[PDB]
């Protein structure tokens, strides 16, 4: 019922506000960097819930589907936003306006350097394709809707998710068509962008494993909303 441009513009107005975390005055330790990253993720998780509720048709899903989709996608959605903030800054991860981290700063936390390279490499892939802003809005919405496997054969949830995922796909094809590039380039661009969803999923899985390990080693504490999403 909503036009592709109307969906893209609705996603634009639904963008969450910037989260203001700051680099601590004391130099970074393994516990302090993990504390800053987890605190940022917890604050961003609040805005993601409000953002997801503004995606057209999301609130029409059952409460079970809403929690299940957000439970499986929250790490991918946060990392996708980080890649967008860092798309024009090679070798740096723009976690926040006042939390800019260099690649070598990942040596402060054991095992996180590999994830930093994964996030930076996928960011470089989006930069090489010159990922436009409106393309980013569609991709990030696709991540939430394509997070939990819902085969058509709750059956109503898989059907609604298919209609929702189809609508955002129509929006993304429309943004790519507005560039005026050839039809062969349009299909190629759609393919290259959507293949990168697997790289975002891969970064999320390794980041999920790392965060669960940091909690197991009692390095970072996990509290409130972030804890619920980890359970």
């Amino acid at each position: 019922a909503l036009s592709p441009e109307q969906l893209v513009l609705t996603l634009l107005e639904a963008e969450p506000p910037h989260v203001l975390i700051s680099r601590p005055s004391a130099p970074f330790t393994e516990a302090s960097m993990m504390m800053s990253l987890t605190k940022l993720a917890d604050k961003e998780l609040v805005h993601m819930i409000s953002w997801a509720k503004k995606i057209p048709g999301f609130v029409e899903l059952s409460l079970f589907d809403q929690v299940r989709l957000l439970e499986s996608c929250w790490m991918e959605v946060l990392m996708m936003g980080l890649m967008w903030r860092s798309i024009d800054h090679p070798g740096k991860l723009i976690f926040a306006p006042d939390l800019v981290l260099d690649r070598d700063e990942g040596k402060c936390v054991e095992g996180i350097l590999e994830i930093f390279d994964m996030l930076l490499a996928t960011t470089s892939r989006f930069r090489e394709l010159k990922l436009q802003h409106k393309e980013y809005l569609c991709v990030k919405a696709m991540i939430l809707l394509n997070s939990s496997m819902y085969p058509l054969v709750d059956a109503d949830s898989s059907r609604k998710l298919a209609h929702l995922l189809n609508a955002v796909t129509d929006a993304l094809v429309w943004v790519i068509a507005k560039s005026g590039i050839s039809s062969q380039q349009q299909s190629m661009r759609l393919a290259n962008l959507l293949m990168l969803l697997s790289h975002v999923r891969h970064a999320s899985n390794k980041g999920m494993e790392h965060l669960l390990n940091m909690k197991c080693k009692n390095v970072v504490p996990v509290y409130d909303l972030l804890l619920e999403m980890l359970n």
Partner: peptide, 9 residues
């Protein structure tokens, strides 16, 4: 999921 249910309603 107390907070998530609350933030969703």
């Amino acid at each position: 999921h107390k907070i998530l249910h609350r933030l969703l309603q």
